[PDB]
From Swiss-Prot, chain A:
Gene responsible for this protein: RPS24A
Region (Disordered): 34-67
Protein name: Small ribosomal subunit protein eS24A
Subunit architecture: Component of the small ribosomal subunit (SSU). Mature yeast ribosomes consist of a small (40S) and a large (60S) subunit. The 40S small subunit contains 1 molecule of ribosomal RNA (18S rRNA) and 33 different proteins (encoded by 57 genes). The large 60S subunit contains 3 rRNA molecules (25S, 5.8S and 5S rRNA) and 46 different proteins (encoded by 81 genes).
Comp. bias regions, Basic residues: 37-47, 56-67
Swiss-Prot record, chain B:
GO biological process: maintenance of translational fidelity; maturation of SSU-rRNA from tricistronic rRNA transcript (SSU-rRNA, 5.8S rRNA, LSU-rRNA); regulation of translational fidelity; translation
Family listed: Belongs to the universal ribosomal protein uS12 family.
Keyword Transmembrane helix tagged: no
Primary role: Component of the ribosome, a large ribonucleoprotein complex responsible for the synthesis of proteins in the cell. The small ribosomal subunit (SSU) binds messenger RNAs (mRNAs) and translates the encoded message by selecting cognate aminoacyl-transfer RNA (tRNA) molecules. The large subunit (LSU) contains the ribosomal catalytic site termed the peptidyl transferase center (PTC), which catalyzes the formation of peptide bonds, thereby polymerizing the amino acids delivered by tRNAs into a polypeptide chain.
Effect after changing P63A: Lethal mutation
GO molecular function terms listed in the Swiss-Prot or TrEMBL record: structural constituent of ribosome
SUPFAM superfamilies per UniProt: Nucleic acid-binding proteins
Protein name as catalogued: Small ribosomal subunit protein uS12A
Post-translational modification comment from the UniProt entry: Hydroxylation at Pro-63 affects translation termination efficiency. The stereochemistry of the 3,4-dihydroxyproline has not yet been determined.
Species of the source: Saccharomyces cerevisiae (strain ATCC 204508 / S288c)
UniProt keyword Hydrolase present: no
UniProtKB/Swiss-Prot annotation, chain C:
Gene: RPS9A
Domain S4 RNA-binding stretches: 106-179
Covalent link Glycyl lysine isopeptide (Lys-Gly) (interchain with G-Cter in ubiquitin), residues: K179
A GO-annotated cellular component: cytosolic small ribosomal subunit
SUPFAM superfamilies cross-referenced by the UniProt entry: Alpha-L RNA-binding motif
Family (UniProt): Belongs to the universal ribosomal protein uS4 family.
Pfam families, per database record: Ribosomal_S4, S4
Keyword rRNA-binding assigned: yes
Designated name of the protein: Small ribosomal subunit protein uS4A
Highest taxon, organism lineage: Eukaryota
One GO BP: translation
From Swiss-Prot, chain E:
Superkingdom field: Eukaryota
Region Disordered, residue ranges: 1-34
InterPro entries: Ribosomal_eS30 (IPR006846)
Entry GO MF terms: structural constituent of ribosome
Key words of the record: Cytoplasm, Phosphoprotein, Ribonucleoprotein, Ribosomal protein
Assembly and interaction partners: Component of the small ribosomal subunit (SSU). Mature yeast ribosomes consist of a small (40S) and a large (60S) subunit. The 40S small subunit contains 1 molecule of ribosomal RNA (18S rRNA) and 33 different proteins (encoded by 57 genes). The large 60S subunit contains 3 rRNA molecules (25S, 5.8S and 5S rRNA) and 46 different proteins (encoded by 81 genes).
Role description: Component of the ribosome, a large ribonucleoprotein complex responsible for the synthesis of proteins in the cell. The small ribosomal subunit (SSU) binds messenger RNAs (mRNAs) and translates the encoded message by selecting cognate aminoacyl-transfer RNA (tRNA) molecules. The large subunit (LSU) contains the ribosomal catalytic site termed the peptidyl transferase center (PTC), which catalyzes the formation of peptide bonds, thereby polymerizing the amino acids delivered by tRNAs into a polypeptide chain.
Family stated for the protein in its record: Belongs to the eukaryotic ribosomal protein eS30 family.
Species this chain originates from: Saccharomyces cerevisiae (strain ATCC 204508 / S288c) (Baker's yeast)
Keyword ATP-binding listed: no
Full protein name: Small ribosomal subunit protein eS30A
Subcellular locations according to the entry: Cytoplasm
Major subcellular site: cytoplasm
RNA sequence: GGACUUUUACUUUGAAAAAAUUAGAGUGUUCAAAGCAGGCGUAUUGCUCGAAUAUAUUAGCAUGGAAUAAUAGAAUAGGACG
RNA sequence: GGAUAGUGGCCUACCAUGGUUUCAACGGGUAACGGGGAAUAAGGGUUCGAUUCCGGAGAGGGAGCCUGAGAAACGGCUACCACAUCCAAGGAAGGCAGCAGGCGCGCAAAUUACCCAAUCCUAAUUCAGGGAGGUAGUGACAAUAAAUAACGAUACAGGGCGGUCUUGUAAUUGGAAUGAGUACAAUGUAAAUACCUUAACGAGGAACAAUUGGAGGGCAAGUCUGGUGCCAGCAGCCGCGGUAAUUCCAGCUCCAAUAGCGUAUAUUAAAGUUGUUGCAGUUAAAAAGCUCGUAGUUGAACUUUGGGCCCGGUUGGCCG
């Protein structure tokens, strides 16, 4: 079985010049997940339709309970 | 020299002469004038799907004497009407006129193939499905 | 948007399709060398005719034309490199005459049988395909190996194959251990 | 086509770059700089293909961002930097220094050089004319301008540069019988020191070059780059020293070193 | 000539052919094995020369 | 540098010349279509060959040839050298 | 002169009367984007290129324009035409010839899935973003390699010359092998999937059971049996069927190609039936009734030949 590998002059050098998927393939980097790419794409657009903080508009939405 | 000029500067005459005489070639002219698209109801395409108008029985040509079963179909993409043969013993019980079928040529450059007077197309599938596969009971005719 | 992965086909076909003389010959050749489809014959005729028009083209070049020499000695070199063209015929005038059969007898199912060890060209094909016989440890199940005449010294079965043996074999262990 | 094209599909990249065909679908577009696009080579290619130092292109940038690489001086961290002919690629790590010189086949080869030789470089002057407040200047193959040059420094002549500073020290001239280097067409790589020039007023003066093998050849003026005196170059040449070995010659001696 | 001939006879003979059922036989060999079988049947023991060869004599 | 040059066709050689394609070299993708890889030791900290060649051919450029086929030249001498 | 970034009838003013054309202008057609190129292999040719690279054009049809270095941009705006959505009837919003996916059209063409790991690109920039691109699915588009079997023993039988050499035809046998599949595992991968490795399984005819055409000629393979009876049907073409059908419908046996094979349409060779190479024209298709004659094609012969000296090249011989 032919392949290819490499050894570092330290582990702090490997943990910084080595791909993260490899670090997790080993167990030297945690596998903490993230939401589906398409999901955050939708979130990006959903966020673009808002201008500003978005904190002062919940005011009017909950303030039209009268109207 | 029997005609054609052999001078070294008569290339124009030679090329235009052959360009003009190539019109005597049927294949060349057919492809150039575009008869395939104007005439020849198929749009020049390989096959064409149509609807069956009537179920005819054509008197065979002589010296033969039979009744070739065919169908008059109206091409859906063009509206033209053509008479096409439904070949093999039976297969006329499978046409069920006002059904949907597909037509192919006869492998004769139009020029209706046999003793069937003026028919240059044949049926391939009725109700869209494998006429020969219907002949041999591999498939079954759909509900409608 | 991405480079086109090149391709080409390896088999020509006789124009006349129903020449009984050529058909009978073709069949005996197939049945002799252990071929399965006649196209493995059509194929060999294809590469042959290609090599032949490649040589015959140079043969009308002015004798000793530079590219003629380079590609000529290159062609004869690779042909002897595989062992089809005799070493006495190394000046390329004999390459126009490499009858097809010389190529077939230089296959691997052929040699696997010629140096005995298969007792049939068919047993040969079956063994080559069944995890058996290698050159070194390089098992090869392509009966059309075209052995290079140098690797022809090492044809002993692979280590694994329970025919020169590494184990009894799947059907044997139980045909015998079923009691 | 509405503006500047910032991509480079594969099969459009220079052939002398030696890029495998199936490696995805695009090549790295060289950036704007000292050398013409079709007449250069980028760092990504050097550090990845020629030197096999970086495996991915992602790793090449990680290498450059540490200021390890410097060319003709400064760091030059542009992954797509258009490093060209005669440029000097030093390397803080490994103590290595390289000069960009072609083969006889026409591609850029890896050629290590001395730390001493890495301090200078040459350039074929491509233009010379007065400028700001009457001070004359010179612009050459490099893509750099040197103010106050010698009044004998004419066009098409080579020049030696300090690279610690800008000013030049020596300036070889384009005269009959001076070492030349062909950079153009695929006679590019051949070397041989001058035969004579055909003026041909109106454009495209042609140069006659004789390699030091009694073999003639011709090229166009903007393709020849004088490098010095016969047998006496001004830089460290590469193996084979550009003498156009024939296909049969190279194959013959390729089979010469036969036994291991 | 006439174009409206009758159509009652469609599939007349296929309809009235007493359809004999196929008969089970051995599983024949594939390409190498099969064409080898033909190599043998045709070039190992010629089965007949009372004149020339015949590949399918029924009553001969 | 100056002063002045009858016009053409043809043929030679060469430069200019994108890659893939094609013809084609090398390399044993287990074969092959392919790919441009790969091959070597001290396989412990390296050694090493490559990534050819050909091809453009009409037109333009450059160069040798002076047959073939044209054009022009001195006749009201308003000719040629000085 | 104006305008442009700038040359220019680009535009204006004045003036003139020029400019292309049988050496085919001008107009028409194109089921026309151009090119690198593809198919067909004596050669000369013939035919095709929407389509992975290069160039151009466009974003439903036009026109106009803001920003800017760069757009007459359209996943920018403005207007008109056509299409067309939401509504509280007041109004508002849309531009898939991007990725998928949908309708229609049709002979005719796949998932509304995964990732920035690779290849490269952009930004303030090692980090973010990238339906560019890469993964898988769908996928007999085409292309490569090539399983569906291999050895026995025996038994009458031939032939070698029943014995001992197998030709093998055998309707009981025989122990061997293996992947198609299945699956620990590792590898593979961004994470998966397949492929490469490989434990456990995993073949005797009920199988892991090859097909598709054809069997009068061209054209390879039966004047076998049954049926039918110019009916049904076959038949590229020549021709078969009207009661023993070598052709139809079948059973049987056989041939060709074989994981492929048939059909329709086009195209190329064959085609020396487009003929430059290379056709034919008395009678088979074809010399204007006749002469003139412009364009075009073509057009006799003759001008430094011959002789002398030199140099040094490249094969190959006798030698080595
Ligand atoms: Mg994202
Ligand atoms: Mg924001
Ligand atoms: Mg006529
Ligand atoms: Mg009618
Ligand atoms: Mg329509
Ligand atoms: Mg760049
Ligand atoms: Mg004017
Ligand atoms: Mg006028
Ligand atoms: Mg005309
Ligand atoms: Mg169009
Ligand atoms: Mg033709
Ligand atoms: Mg195109
Ligand atoms: Mg076209
Ligand atoms: Mg179109
Ligand atoms: Mg494009
Ligand atoms: Mg546009
Ligand atoms: Mg649309
Ligand atoms: Mg309009
Ligand atoms: Mg627009
Ligand atoms: Mg859009
Ligand atoms: Mg856009
Ligand atoms: Mg309201
Ligand atoms: Mg879409
Ligand atoms: Mg399809
Ligand atoms: Mg995509
Ligand atoms: Mg995609
Ligand atoms: Mg099977
Ligand atoms: Mg079985
Ligand atoms: Mg059959
Ligand atoms: Mg026959
Ligand atoms: Mg007739
Ligand atoms: Mg009867
Ligand atoms: Mg009967
Ligand atoms: Mg009968
Ligand atoms: Mg039959
Ligand atoms: Mg075929
Ligand atoms: Mg000729
Ligand atoms: Mg004729
Ligand atoms: Mg007559
Ligand atoms: Mg007459
Ligand atoms: Mg007249
Ligand atoms: Mg003459």
């Amino acid at each position: 079985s032919v392949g290819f590998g490499l050894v570092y002059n330290s582990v702090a050098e490997a943990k910084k010049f080595e791909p993260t998927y490899r670090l997790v393939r080993y167990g030297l980097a945690e596998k903490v997940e993230k939401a589906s790419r398409q999901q955050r794409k939708q979130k990006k657009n959903r966020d673009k339709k808002i201008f500003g903080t978005g904190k002062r508009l919940a005011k009017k939405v909950a303030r039209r309970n009268a109207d | 020299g029997k005609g054609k000029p052999r001078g070294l500067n008569s290339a124009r005459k030679l090329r235009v002469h052959r360009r003009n005489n190539r019109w005597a070639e049927n294949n060349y002219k057919k492809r150039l004038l575009g008869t395939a698209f104007k005439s020849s109801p198929f749009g020049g395409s390989s096959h064409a799907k149509g609807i069956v108008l009537e179920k005819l029985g054509i008197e065979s040509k002589q010296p033969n004497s039979a009744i070739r079963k065919c169908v008059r179909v109206q091409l859906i993409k063009n509206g033209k009407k053509v008479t096409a043969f439904v070949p093999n013993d039976g297969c006329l019980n499978f046409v069920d006129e006002n059904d949907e079928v597909l037509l192919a040529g006869f492998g004769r450059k139009g020029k209706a193939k046999g003793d069937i007077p003026g028919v240059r197309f044949k049926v391939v599938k009725v109700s869209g499905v494998s006429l020969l596969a219907l002949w041999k009971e591999k498939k079954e005719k759909p509900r409608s | 948007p991405r480079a086109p992965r090149t391709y080409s086909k390896t088999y020509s076909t006789p124009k006349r399709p129903y020449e009984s003389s050529r058909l009978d010959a073709e069949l005996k050749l197939a049945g002799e060398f252990g071929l399965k489809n006649k196209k493995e014959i059509y194929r060999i005729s294809f590469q042959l005719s290609k090599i032949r028009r490649a040589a015959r083209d140079l043969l009308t070049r002015d004798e000793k034309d530079p590219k003629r020499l380079f590609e000529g000695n290159a062609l004869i070199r690779r042909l002897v490199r595989v062992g089809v063209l005799s070493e006495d015929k190394k000046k390329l005038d004999y390459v126009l005459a490499l009858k097809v059969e010389d190529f077939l007898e230089r296959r691997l199912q052929t040699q696997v049988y010629k140096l005995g060890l298969a007792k049939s060209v068919h047993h040969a094909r079956v063994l080559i395909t069944q995890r058996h016989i290698a050159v070194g440890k390089q098992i090869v199940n392509i009966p059309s190996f075209m052995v290079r005449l140098d690797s022809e010294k090492h044809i002993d079965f692979a280590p694994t194959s329970p025919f020169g043996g590494a184990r009894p074999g799947r059907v044997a262990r139980r045909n015998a251990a079923r009691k | 086509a509405r503006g500047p094209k910032k991509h480079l599909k594969r099969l459009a990249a220079p052939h002398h770059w030696l890029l495998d065909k199936l490696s995805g679908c695009y090549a790295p577009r060289p950036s704007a700089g000292p050398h013409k696009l079709r007449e250069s080579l980028p760092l990504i290619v050097f550090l990845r293909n020629r030197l096999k130092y970086a495996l991915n292109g992602r790793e090449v940038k990680a290498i450059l961002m540490q200021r390890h690489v410097k060319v003709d001086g400064k760091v030059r961290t542009d992954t797509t930097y258009p490093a060209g002919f005669m440029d000097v690629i030093t390397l803080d790590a490994t103590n290595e220094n390289f000069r960009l010189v072609y083969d006889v086949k026409g591609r850029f080869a890896v050629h290590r050089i001395t730390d001493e030789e890495a301090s200078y470089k040459l350039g074929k002057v491509k233009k010379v004319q007065l400028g700001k407040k009457g001070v004359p200047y010179v612009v050459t193959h490099d893509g750099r301008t040197i103010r106050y040059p010698d009044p004998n420094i004419k066009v098409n002549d080579t020049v030696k540069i300090d690279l610690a500073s800008g000013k030049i020290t020596d300036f070889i001239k384009f005269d009959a019988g001076k070492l030349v280097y062909v950079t153009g067409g695929r006679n590019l790589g051949r070397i041989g020191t001058i035969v004579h020039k055909e003026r041909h007023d109106g454009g495209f003066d042609l140069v006659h070059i004789k390699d030091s093998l009694d073999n003639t050849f011709v090229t166009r003026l903007n393709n020849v780059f004088v490098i010095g005196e016969q047998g006496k170059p001004y830089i460290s040449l590469p193996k084979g020293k550009g003498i156009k070995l024939s296909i049969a010659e190279e194959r013959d001696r390729r089979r010469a070193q036969q036994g291991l | 000539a006439k174009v409206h001939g009758s159509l009652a006879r469609a599939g007349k003979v296929k309809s009235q052919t007493p359809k004999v059922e196929k008969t089970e036989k051995p599983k024949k060999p594939k390409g190498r094995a099969y064409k080898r079988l033909l190599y043998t049947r045709r070039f190992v023991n010629v089965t007949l020369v009372n004149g020339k060869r015949r590949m399918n004599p029924g009553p001969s």
